[PDB]
Design an enzyme around this catalytic site. Structure first.
Site, PDB file in Angstrom:
ATOM      1  N   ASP A  64      41.222  40.562  28.286  1.00  0.00           N
ATOM      2  CA  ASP A  64      41.642  40.302  29.657  1.00  0.00           C
ATOM      3  C   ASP A  64      40.502  39.779  30.523  1.00  0.00           C
ATOM      4  OD1 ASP A  64      44.488  41.076  29.712  1.00  0.00           O
ATOM      5  OD2 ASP A  64      43.721  43.070  29.200  1.00  0.00           O
ATOM      6  N   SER A  96      37.432  38.181  35.150  1.00  0.00           N
ATOM      7  CA  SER A  96      38.188  39.428  35.035  1.00  0.00           C
ATOM      8  C   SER A  96      39.604  39.129  35.514  1.00  0.00           C
ATOM      9  CB  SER A  96      37.550  40.550  35.844  1.00  0.00           C
ATOM     10  OG  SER A  96      38.435  41.648  35.973  1.00  0.00           O
ATOM     11  N   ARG A  97      40.525  38.940  34.568  1.00  0.00           N
ATOM     12  CA  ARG A  97      41.874  38.511  34.916  1.00  0.00           C
ATOM     13  C   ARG A  97      42.642  39.563  35.705  1.00  0.00           C
ATOM     14  NH1 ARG A  97      43.383  34.295  30.624  1.00  0.00           N
ATOM     15  NH2 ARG A  97      45.547  35.038  30.701  1.00  0.00           N
ATOM     16  N   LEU A  98      42.279  40.842  35.578  1.00  0.00           N
ATOM     17  CA  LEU A  98      42.922  41.873  36.385  1.00  0.00           C
ATOM     18  C   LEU A  98      42.604  41.695  37.864  1.00  0.00           C
ATOM     19  CD1 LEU A  98      44.736  44.281  35.429  1.00  0.00           C
ATOM     20  CD2 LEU A  98      43.519  43.085  33.603  1.00  0.00           C
TER      21      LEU A  98
END
Lengths: 260, 189, 132, 98, 132
Positions: free
Chosen positions: C54, C79-81
């Site tokens: 992710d 950081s895709r979150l």
């Protein structure tokens, strides 16, 4: 297409990237020298003005083409064409063109071309200034024209990109006035050189960016090619091993088919 | 077929960003259109971030699409390209180094670039502004209107994130009326 | 590598995540480590692993040689979150810092002439250095 | 081990300076300090011809050395890199331009 | 290539050397030749032969184009033996030739870009041109 060649290309690109920084340093030093000289020229011109004051509408438009021919020069040339078409009349104004581009522009506008020169004459200030001073003295004695201005297809920072231009005239009497004219021309050339040096610095930054992009593209191509070659080599090597063991596979298939 | 239409929109992500990959080549052989999203456009704040120059569609032909639509599309694309070139010139030389034609081209290109942004109905639950669904007719009419430089006086910041073209004029006139009232009240003190 | 090297790692790393109260209610966080060769992100296994996780924290050798520790490259790290993985106070506190860092890097690499725009030049040269 | 120390000093040949060769990649997994020699530096007559900028050791920390040793090493590496940068300027524009 | 392609060349080339009086008292000098493709010395056979021999004399195509005869690359060639393989007079005569050639090559390569050179640079150019 070997890693040696890619390494050579990348080392050349890195050497050029360093050399562009070195060129930036050199150009900045030359710019500082030019500005320092121009301050003294300005003070000398003011003093000459004062001493001339103690001792005391047809316009000759002079156009100068840019140093080279690229996108920036073409845009500046078309802006110069617009300006000339705006504020010059073929009847009451005379045009002196140096360089092929502005000569063609004037000929297309059919303006009064008094004389034509070569661009290299602008390289040395002394000869160009002397010839222009003789021509303007001849014209003023004959009263052919009154005002004198110089146009160069070159961007200026103080004008937010506007073309550099100044009307010198108006502002042993003959020797003093000739010296004042020469000082004015020297100042104009120095201002042009300053602006050119700033533009050259920005162009150096652009060149560094282009070099980095080229390096990235070369890395991409090398990675793709090496991956392809390695995969083909590995498959072709295993082909022999898988060919040499056909009989065992066939016998296993037979005995599994029979089975129980 | 005669029973109906099955349309497919297929998202492709190639690891390492290699579009000469055999999978990418095989998939591109069937695509009738491509929607290519740009990181630079997203960085500039253009949402959606679809690149209108790198993308393509086979439906921009004379066999399907009307002549005026093709003309509008071609003019828009070439104006955007010329605007990009002139902006590259501007960033070094300066703005006032162009003629009037180049400045008009730059203005039209900027207004075209910011007219293509649009709010989405599916994203109005955390952005406040309601979304839009612009029909093709309205999009073509507004793009044609902007192309001729009929709104070159309206500031570029008004063009961003709008639906039909008329909302630009409405907002501009409302702001002009409010400014006129404030000017009249400023002269009364 | 074998033909199913991607499946071996995907079926391994897909066992992490957050689970519901009826299925355990816990979580498993995974921090796999991968080695590149001279910055070559485009390697087979590194690009296989990037397309599974992710996001990634990329450690740069240039920063390590320059003395920056930890040598983490913010430009190449994702950081895709995003703020969804931050608390409300941290999301409020660290809002819009990556943009300022990228702007500071852009200005630093392209200062060019000594001409200065405004006090905003000092603003950036102050806050970016404070962040660094 | 409690009985004594076994220190190892192993010489390696890197083919065509290809540090991504699988043999080199396998070797770096175990090296605790790498000393990289340069053919240019040797050709300049400098011996033992050890490249100080490229080489590095894991034992040049505060866990094993003093503050003075670390400061001296860091200042030396910084000075060598800076003079290497400035030598190109000297060669191109002349020693006066500094 | 077969698995033992290194062995068939190492066992062949290690049969040359100088021998003591009790074992023949002679000497065998070997000058093997190897061809590279576009300068790629990273091939398997060139790598083996470089690993086996005591020194390498590189011939360059660029130097051949430049007009050098013979086009021997001094900067790439190596001789591990050194003055040990030279007579005393020859060793005295050729003390610092390689350093002079290296400096001259560096200066000549940078001459196309530089503009200002010191008097030591002029003497280096003269000595390098005389050496060539």
């Amino acid at each position: 297409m070997k890693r040696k060649d890619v390494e050579e290309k990348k080392q050349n690109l890195d050497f050029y990237h360093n050399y562009i920084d070195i060129s930036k340093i050199k150009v900045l030093q030359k710019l500082n020298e030019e500005i320092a000289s121009l301050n003294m020229l300005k003070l000398q011109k003011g003093e000459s003005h004062y001493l001339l004051n103690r001792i005391i509408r047809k316009e000759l438009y002079i156009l100068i083409d840019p140093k080279k021919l690229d996108l920036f020069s073409e845009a500046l040339l078309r802006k110069l064409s617009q300006t000339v078409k705006e504020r010059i009349r073929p009847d009451k104004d005379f045009v002196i063109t140096v360089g092929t581009n502005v000569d063609n522009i004037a000929r297309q506008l059919n303006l009064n071309i008094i004389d034509h020169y070569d661009l290299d004459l602008f390289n040395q200030i002394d000869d160009f200034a002397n010839r222009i001073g003789e021509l303007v003295d001849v014209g003023l004695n004959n009263k052919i024209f009154n005002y004198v201005s110089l146009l160069i297809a070159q961007s200026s920072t103080k004008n937010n990109g506007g073309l550099v231009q100044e009307r010198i005239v108006p502002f042993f009497y003959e020797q003093f006035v000739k010296s004042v004219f020469k000082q004015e021309l020297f100042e104009f050339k120095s201002i042009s050189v300053i602006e050119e040096l700033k533009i050259e610095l920005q162009l150096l930054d652009e060149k560094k960016k282009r070099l980095e992009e080229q390096k990235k593209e070369l890395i991409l191509k090398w990675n793709r090619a090496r991956k392809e070659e390695a995969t083909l080599q590995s498959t072709l090597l295993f082909s022999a091993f898988k060919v040499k063991n056909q009989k065992s596979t066939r016998d296993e298939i037979l005995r599994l088919s029979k089975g129980k | 077929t005669k029973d109906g239409d099955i349309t497919s929109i297929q998202a492709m992500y190639i690891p390492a960003d290699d579009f000469t990959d055999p999978a990418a080549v095989a998939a591109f052989a069937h695509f009738d259109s491509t929607i290519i999203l740009s990181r630079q456009l997203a960085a500039e704040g253009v949402y959606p971030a679809i690149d209108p120059l790198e993308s393509n569609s086979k439906m921009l032909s004379i066999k399907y699409t009307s002549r005026e639509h093709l003309d509008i599309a071609k003019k828009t694309v070439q104006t955007l390209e010329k605007t990009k070139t002139l902006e590259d010139i501007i960033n070094i030389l300066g703005f006032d180094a162009l003629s009037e034609d180049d400045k008009k081209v730059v203005e039209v290109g900027r207004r075209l670039k910011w007219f293509l942004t649009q709010p989405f109905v599916v994203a109005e639950k955390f952005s406040g502004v309601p979304g839009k669904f612009v029909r093709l007719k309205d999009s073509l009419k507004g793009i044609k209107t902007i192309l001729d430089g009929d709104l070159n006086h309206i500031p570029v910041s008004y063009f961003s994130f709008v639906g039909v073209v008329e909302e630009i004029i409405e907002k501009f006139n409302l702001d002009a009326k409010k400014e006129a009232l404030k000017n009249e009240l400023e002269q009364n003190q | 590598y074998p033909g199913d090297i991607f499946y071996v790692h995907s079926s391994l790393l897909e066992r992490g995540g957050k689970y519901g109260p009826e299925f355990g209610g816990g979580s498993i966080t995974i921090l796999p480590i991968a080695q590149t060769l001279a910055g070559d992100i485009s390697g087979y296994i590194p690009t296989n692993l990037i397309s599974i996780t992710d996001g990634q924290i990329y450690t740069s050798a240039k920063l390590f040689n320059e003395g920056t520790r930890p040598a983490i490259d913010v430009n190449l790290s994702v950081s895709r979150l995003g703020s969804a993985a931050q608390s409300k106070f941290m999301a409020f506190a660290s809002s819009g810092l990556k943009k300022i860092y990228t702007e500071y890097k852009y200005l630093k690499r392209l200062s060019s002439f000594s001409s200065k725009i405004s006090n905003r030049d000092l603003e950036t040269l102050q806050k970016g250095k404070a962040f660094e």
